[PDB]
C-alpha cells in the first residue's frame, strides 16, 4: 500500500506501540477501549503500553467474544481502529508498529 | 452532578505584580485534581481567543497617502509606524469607530501618550514611542480605533469603504500579550496559578474574569435547564396606453394605489370607462397582488422602497 | 495558521510562533538546525533575562 | 567552522537559565497537557523565501 | 545632523578639508521595486546627534537591522509534530507570527502599460473605456491612472487604455440588443491594464 | 411581428435584410414595417421583458 | 463592556446525529468562534471523564481475591473477565454511601443485571451486559460494593477485590473541530455508562465547569 504513513503517523504509532515493563498502572485490567483513555486522563495509566484491558480480536469465523487480552493500552488505540474481520486484529499490532 | 465537588476558593488572591496591573497572576488553591489543567487551559485559550479590546485599525496620516511611503520629518517610515501603531493598547468602552488624532512634534520621539484622544478612549503605554522626528515638521496622524476580537487582517475593514489616504493597518484587538499557566498540587487538590500578563487595556484580575464569563456564556447554551407588488411604479407594468396616463394623472406613482381601488377609482377621472375596468385588476392579480388585501397607502414612504 | 491560543504553551506562558517537524533532522542530517535552535533559545532566554 | 561546539552550547544554556538538556517543557495548546518528553523550543532563524 | 527617513544629513568630519566636499547627505532609498519585484527599503538606524565614523553602515537596507544582515525574523520554534500539520517538511505556523506583522514583505509589482499609436488611430489613455461599471473607475484621476496611494483590488482598472480600431464583426443578436437599449456600438476596444488575481491592493508610485 | 423583426437582423438566417427587404416579406414595403419595428423595440424595454438583458449589454 | 456577546454563539446546539440509544449522542455545534470549538471540547472531555457522580462495584465473591482462579469453578470465563464486565455495570445510586449489591444465579443461564439483588436505592440500567451461564451452576455468591465517588478512581479486608471502577456516568467521550464557513463546529461524541442521557451529560459537564469557573469579579 502506498497510503502507508510516511513520517508522522508512523512515529505516532511507534510511540503508541512501544511497550516498557516499567510504567504506571501495571496490569490494571480495563473494561472497554474508553476506559484506557479515561484512566489516562486521570493520570493513573501512562501511554507506555504496559496495561491490560479487553478487546475483540475477531480471529475465527463469525463474531469473536471479547476475550481479555494481555495486550497494552497504546496498541489498543490502534487496535480499535482495525476493522473487525478474521485473520486481523491485535495480533498485527503486537509488534513495534514501525513503518514496514 | 452539579455544585457537589470541591468548589474553588471564594475570592481567590490576585497577587499583584510589578507591572502596574499588567501581570497580576491569579491563584486558586482548592481545585479538582483532573480539573486544574482543564479550567486553566480553557480559560487561557478562550480568554486569549476572545477579549473585546481596541486598537488602531485605520490610520489617517496627512503627510502620506498609503502605508508604504515615508513621512516628511519622521525617522520611521509609514509602514514602520503601522508596526508601532498596531501594538498600541487602547481601551474605549464604547461601540463604534473613533477618531483618535495625533499631532506632535519638537524633540522627535513622539510617545503614544501624547495623542489627542477623546474622553472615552484611554490610550495605554504612555512611554511607548510610535516614530521619531528630526526637529522639523510634525505629523497629523488621525486614528480610527475600533473594538474587535483577537486579530483582524488589514484587507477586511480598510479597503471596504474609505477615502484614498487611509492606512490599512490590521490592528490586533487581543488585550493580553502572554498568558501563563501553572498547576501545583496541594485529598490532593492542585492549585491553578494563572499569570496572564495582559496589557493596560484590561487588568489581569479583570481579564481572567472576562474569560470566565465568556466561557460561562458559551456553556450556558450547552445546558438544557441546569411581495413587492405595490412597490413598482405606476408605469412599470405597461398595461396599456390608457392605463399609465390615468395612473400618472390620478396622483399615484406606486402600485398599491392602483391595487387598492378596483372600480371606484375608474369613475373619478376620464378614460376609465367600462372598456378597461377589469383587465388592470386581472393583470395586478396575476402579478401576485389582488384587489386590496393590504393597508391604504401603507408603503407610501421610502421605508419599504426597493 | 494556528491562532495564538492553540499553539503549544511554554513554561513561561509564551506560545511558540512556529512548530517544525523533528523528522527532518534524522532523514536529512541537518542536526546543526537543532544546535542552532538550542543556541537561539539560549540567546532568547538571555534577552528575556536582560530585558527583565 | 569555528563556532560553538556541544560543550559551548551546553555552558551557554547553563549560564542562560536554560535546561541543561537543551530542550524545555512545552505545554500543549490545542488540548493542554504537559508533554511527557523534553521538547526543543528555541528561536530558529526562519525565512520568507520568494517562492510564495 | 538630522534624520527624516527619506534622507540623512551628516557633518563633514572631525578634521575636514576647507572646500573638499563639505557635508555629505545620504538620500535614503525608499520603497522601490527590486529586480525580484520585492521591496527595497532603508531605515536610518543612526539617531539624531550621534557621531559616526567613516566606513560603517548608517541606514540598514532591505532585510537588515542594526547594520547586520537579517534575511528574516527569529521566531520561537518547537521541533515537534503538532497534530500532523507538519507531517511532511511543511512548517506549522502560529498566528503571532502573522498578527505581529513579523514575516510580511511588500513585493512591489510595478506593472507597466503602454500607449503605442496603433495603425487604426492613435491609442488613448483617457479616463475609461465604455461599457465599464463605475465601481471599477474608482481611484482614477482625470488622466485615467490610479491615484497614488489608492488600494486596487485584483482585477480592478489600473490605467484606462482606449485603443481605436475598426468596426467589430456585426452580430445579429448584439445589434438587436444595441438597438433595444438604444446605445451605439463602441468603435474602440477595451484594452485598459488591470491587476492580475492577487492581493496587491495599494499603489505606491504611478510613473508616466 | 417576431418573424419580421428576426428577418430585420437574422437569428437563423444570416442574410441581414434592410427595412424594405424585410418589408416585402410581410406586407407592402413602406414605413409600416419601420413603425412596427420601432414599436417592438420600444416594447421590450420594460423591467419585465428587458430584465435579463439589463446586465447583458454591459 | 460586553465581550461575551459580540461573538458567534451556537444558539441551536440540539444537533444529535447518533440516536441509537440513550448512551451515545453526537452533540454538534454549528457556529462557534475560531478556537472555541477545541477549547470547549477539551473542557467537556476532561470534565466528563473527571470527577462526577457515578457508581462502581469494587467487590467479588469470597475466596476470589486473586485472579489466577475463578470464584469456585468458572461459569463461562475467567474471574478477570467477570470483574471487567461488572466494572462497566451502569448503576446510578441516589443516596450517598458504599451500598452493597448481591448477585445469586442458580440454573443454566447467563446471569444478567436484572438478577442482581441490591435494595440500597440503586437501579441497574443495562440489564444485559454479563453472561455467566453454567449447567446447574449456583456458585456465584457475588456481592458488590457500589459507592458514589468522583471520576475514575484507581484501586486504593481479605477477599475484597480492588476494582478500579470509575465513578463517572460517561465512559467514552471524544470531540472534533472542523471549520464551518473559520468558525469551528464542536461535534464531540459522548458515550455514558448508561445511567445518564448524553444530551444532558454535556449539560451537567458545562454546568460543573461554570460553577467551578467562579473566578470573575465585578459582574451582575
mmCIF file of N, CA and C in Angstrom, chain G residues 154-211:
data_model
loop_
_atom_site.group_PDB
_atom_site.id
_atom_site.type_symbol
_atom_site.label_atom_id
_atom_site.label_comp_id
_atom_site.label_asym_id
_atom_site.label_seq_id
_atom_site.Cartn_x
_atom_site.Cartn_y
_atom_site.Cartn_z
ATOM 1 N N UNK G 154 -8.590 4.841 40.867
ATOM 2 C CA UNK G 154 -7.989 3.502 40.813
ATOM 3 C C UNK G 154 -8.208 2.715 42.094
ATOM 4 N N UNK G 155 -7.709 1.482 42.131
ATOM 5 C CA UNK G 155 -7.852 0.634 43.309
ATOM 6 C C UNK G 155 -7.004 1.191 44.445
ATOM 7 N N UNK G 156 -7.659 1.751 45.457
ATOM 8 C CA UNK G 156 -6.958 2.317 46.603
ATOM 9 C C UNK G 156 -6.374 1.218 47.485
ATOM 10 N N UNK G 157 -10.078 -5.591 53.820
ATOM 11 C CA UNK G 157 -10.328 -6.960 54.284
ATOM 12 C C UNK G 157 -9.802 -8.013 53.314
ATOM 13 N N UNK G 158 -9.912 -9.280 53.694
ATOM 14 C CA UNK G 158 -9.445 -10.388 52.871
ATOM 15 C C UNK G 158 -10.551 -10.796 51.910
ATOM 16 N N UNK G 159 -10.181 -11.017 50.649
ATOM 17 C CA UNK G 159 -11.108 -11.420 49.619
ATOM 18 C C UNK G 159 -11.705 -10.278 48.822
ATOM 19 N N UNK G 160 -11.775 -9.083 49.402
ATOM 20 C CA UNK G 160 -12.328 -7.933 48.700
ATOM 21 C C UNK G 160 -11.411 -7.539 47.547
ATOM 22 N N UNK G 161 -11.920 -7.648 46.320
ATOM 23 C CA UNK G 161 -11.130 -7.295 45.149
ATOM 24 C C UNK G 161 -10.993 -5.782 45.058
ATOM 25 N N UNK G 162 -9.821 -5.324 44.619
ATOM 26 C CA UNK G 162 -9.557 -3.894 44.460
ATOM 27 C C UNK G 162 -9.851 -3.509 43.013
ATOM 28 N N UNK G 163 -11.129 -3.269 42.743
ATOM 29 C CA UNK G 163 -11.590 -2.902 41.410
ATOM 30 C C UNK G 163 -11.453 -1.397 41.239
ATOM 31 N N UNK G 164 -10.768 -0.984 40.177
ATOM 32 C CA UNK G 164 -10.570 0.434 39.882
ATOM 33 C C UNK G 164 -11.671 0.974 38.974
ATOM 34 N N UNK G 165 -12.921 0.751 39.366
ATOM 35 C CA UNK G 165 -14.043 1.223 38.570
ATOM 36 C C UNK G 165 -14.191 2.735 38.697
ATOM 37 N N UNK G 166 -14.643 3.360 37.615
ATOM 38 C CA UNK G 166 -14.767 4.808 37.554
ATOM 39 C C UNK G 166 -16.097 5.259 38.143
ATOM 40 N N UNK G 167 -16.049 6.337 38.923
ATOM 41 C CA UNK G 167 -17.256 6.952 39.473
ATOM 42 C C UNK G 167 -17.740 8.075 38.555
ATOM 43 N N UNK G 168 -17.978 7.710 37.299
ATOM 44 C CA UNK G 168 -18.389 8.659 36.280
ATOM 45 C C UNK G 168 -19.541 8.091 35.467
ATOM 46 N N UNK G 169 -20.446 8.946 34.997
ATOM 47 C CA UNK G 169 -21.579 8.456 34.202
ATOM 48 C C UNK G 169 -21.209 8.237 32.745
ATOM 49 N N UNK G 170 -20.203 8.961 32.263
ATOM 50 C CA UNK G 170 -19.743 8.855 30.884
ATOM 51 C C UNK G 170 -18.543 7.923 30.834
ATOM 52 N N UNK G 171 -18.511 7.060 29.822
ATOM 53 C CA UNK G 171 -17.430 6.102 29.634
ATOM 54 C C UNK G 171 -16.492 6.492 28.502
ATOM 55 N N UNK G 172 -17.028 6.740 27.311
ATOM 56 C CA UNK G 172 -16.238 7.128 26.150
ATOM 57 C C UNK G 172 -16.707 8.490 25.664
ATOM 58 N N UNK G 173 -15.768 9.422 25.522
ATOM 59 C CA UNK G 173 -16.067 10.775 25.067
ATOM 60 C C UNK G 173 -14.956 11.226 24.130
ATOM 61 N N UNK G 174 -15.338 11.810 22.998
ATOM 62 C CA UNK G 174 -14.379 12.307 22.025
ATOM 63 C C UNK G 174 -14.988 13.495 21.298
ATOM 64 N N UNK G 175 -14.136 14.453 20.942
ATOM 65 C CA UNK G 175 -14.571 15.673 20.281
ATOM 66 C C UNK G 175 -13.800 15.858 18.981
ATOM 67 N N UNK G 176 -14.337 16.723 18.124
ATOM 68 C CA UNK G 176 -13.696 17.069 16.866
ATOM 69 C C UNK G 176 -14.007 18.522 16.547
ATOM 70 N N UNK G 177 -13.090 19.167 15.832
ATOM 71 C CA UNK G 177 -13.200 20.582 15.497
ATOM 72 C C UNK G 177 -12.887 20.738 14.016
ATOM 73 N N UNK G 178 -13.892 21.133 13.233
ATOM 74 C CA UNK G 178 -13.729 21.389 11.812
ATOM 75 C C UNK G 178 -14.436 22.692 11.468
ATOM 76 N N UNK G 179 -13.796 23.563 10.692
ATOM 77 C CA UNK G 179 -14.413 24.854 10.374
ATOM 78 C C UNK G 179 -15.648 24.689 9.504
ATOM 79 N N UNK G 180 -16.630 25.559 9.742
ATOM 80 C CA UNK G 180 -17.894 25.565 9.005
ATOM 81 C C UNK G 180 -18.147 26.992 8.528
ATOM 82 N N UNK G 181 -17.631 27.320 7.349
ATOM 83 C CA UNK G 181 -17.808 28.650 6.780
ATOM 84 C C UNK G 181 -18.297 28.566 5.339
ATOM 85 N N UNK G 182 -13.988 29.952 9.226
ATOM 86 C CA UNK G 182 -13.030 29.842 10.319
ATOM 87 C C UNK G 182 -13.718 29.406 11.609
ATOM 88 N N UNK G 183 -15.045 29.509 11.628
ATOM 89 C CA UNK G 183 -15.810 29.117 12.804
ATOM 90 C C UNK G 183 -15.761 27.605 12.986
ATOM 91 N N UNK G 184 -15.405 27.169 14.190
ATOM 92 C CA UNK G 184 -15.317 25.747 14.482
ATOM 93 C C UNK G 184 -16.702 25.164 14.748
ATOM 94 N N UNK G 185 -16.811 23.852 14.557
ATOM 95 C CA UNK G 185 -18.050 23.106 14.763
ATOM 96 C C UNK G 185 -17.765 22.000 15.774
ATOM 97 N N UNK G 186 -18.012 22.291 17.049
ATOM 98 C CA UNK G 186 -17.790 21.317 18.112
ATOM 99 C C UNK G 186 -18.783 20.170 17.963
ATOM 100 N N UNK G 187 -18.278 18.992 17.598
ATOM 101 C CA UNK G 187 -19.116 17.848 17.253
ATOM 102 C C UNK G 187 -18.773 16.649 18.130
ATOM 103 N N UNK G 188 -18.430 16.904 19.393
ATOM 104 C CA UNK G 188 -17.966 15.844 20.281
ATOM 105 C C UNK G 188 -19.017 14.748 20.424
ATOM 106 N N UNK G 189 -18.549 13.504 20.491
ATOM 107 C CA UNK G 189 -19.409 12.336 20.636
ATOM 108 C C UNK G 189 -19.185 11.746 22.022
ATOM 109 N N UNK G 190 -20.153 11.942 22.913
ATOM 110 C CA UNK G 190 -20.071 11.460 24.286
ATOM 111 C C UNK G 190 -20.820 10.140 24.393
ATOM 112 N N UNK G 191 -20.288 9.229 25.205
ATOM 113 C CA UNK G 191 -20.914 7.938 25.461
ATOM 114 C C UNK G 191 -20.859 7.669 26.956
ATOM 115 N N UNK G 192 -22.025 7.526 27.574
ATOM 116 C CA UNK G 192 -22.133 7.362 29.015
ATOM 117 C C UNK G 192 -22.228 5.885 29.386
ATOM 118 N N UNK G 193 -22.083 5.615 30.685
ATOM 119 C CA UNK G 193 -22.195 4.243 31.168
ATOM 120 C C UNK G 193 -23.615 3.714 31.019
ATOM 121 N N UNK G 194 -24.607 4.599 31.041
ATOM 122 C CA UNK G 194 -25.986 4.195 30.865
ATOM 123 C C UNK G 194 -26.959 4.912 31.777
ATOM 124 N N UNK G 195 -26.527 5.264 32.986
ATOM 125 C CA UNK G 195 -27.408 5.963 33.921
ATOM 126 C C UNK G 195 -27.273 7.477 33.796
ATOM 127 N N UNK G 196 -27.313 7.962 32.558
ATOM 128 C CA UNK G 196 -27.405 9.387 32.264
ATOM 129 C C UNK G 196 -27.640 9.538 30.768
ATOM 130 N N UNK G 197 -28.425 10.527 30.376
ATOM 131 C CA UNK G 197 -28.606 10.769 28.951
ATOM 132 C C UNK G 197 -27.459 11.629 28.428
ATOM 133 N N UNK G 198 -26.860 11.275 27.287
ATOM 134 C CA UNK G 198 -25.716 12.058 26.796
ATOM 135 C C UNK G 198 -26.082 13.480 26.415
ATOM 136 N N UNK G 199 -27.343 13.737 26.063
ATOM 137 C CA UNK G 199 -27.756 15.104 25.765
ATOM 138 C C UNK G 199 -27.696 15.965 27.018
ATOM 139 N N UNK G 200 -27.853 15.358 28.195
ATOM 140 C CA UNK G 200 -27.743 16.071 29.459
ATOM 141 C C UNK G 200 -26.407 15.854 30.153
ATOM 142 N N UNK G 201 -25.612 14.874 29.718
ATOM 143 C CA UNK G 201 -24.283 14.702 30.296
ATOM 144 C C UNK G 201 -23.392 15.895 29.982
ATOM 145 N N UNK G 202 -23.409 16.358 28.731
ATOM 146 C CA UNK G 202 -22.640 17.543 28.372
ATOM 147 C C UNK G 202 -23.178 18.771 29.093
ATOM 148 N N UNK G 203 -24.491 18.833 29.322
ATOM 149 C CA UNK G 203 -25.053 19.948 30.079
ATOM 150 C C UNK G 203 -24.566 19.936 31.522
ATOM 151 N N UNK G 204 -24.540 18.758 32.149
ATOM 152 C CA UNK G 204 -24.005 18.643 33.501
ATOM 153 C C UNK G 204 -22.534 19.036 33.542
ATOM 154 N N UNK G 205 -21.763 18.614 32.537
ATOM 155 C CA UNK G 205 -20.349 18.973 32.490
ATOM 156 C C UNK G 205 -20.167 20.480 32.349
ATOM 157 N N UNK G 206 -20.956 21.112 31.478
ATOM 158 C CA UNK G 206 -20.858 22.557 31.302
ATOM 159 C C UNK G 206 -21.273 23.296 32.566
ATOM 160 N N UNK G 207 -22.306 22.807 33.255
ATOM 161 C CA UNK G 207 -22.728 23.448 34.495
ATOM 162 C C UNK G 207 -21.666 23.304 35.577
ATOM 163 N N UNK G 208 -21.019 22.139 35.654
ATOM 164 C CA UNK G 208 -19.936 21.954 36.615
ATOM 165 C C UNK G 208 -18.776 22.885 36.293
ATOM 166 N N UNK G 209 -18.433 23.005 35.008
ATOM 167 C CA UNK G 209 -17.349 23.896 34.607
ATOM 168 C C UNK G 209 -17.680 25.347 34.936
ATOM 169 N N UNK G 210 -18.937 25.747 34.744
ATOM 170 C CA UNK G 210 -19.332 27.114 35.066
ATOM 171 C C UNK G 210 -19.305 27.359 36.569
ATOM 172 N N UNK G 211 -19.791 26.396 37.357
ATOM 173 C CA UNK G 211 -19.785 26.555 38.807
ATOM 174 C C UNK G 211 -18.364 26.613 39.349
#
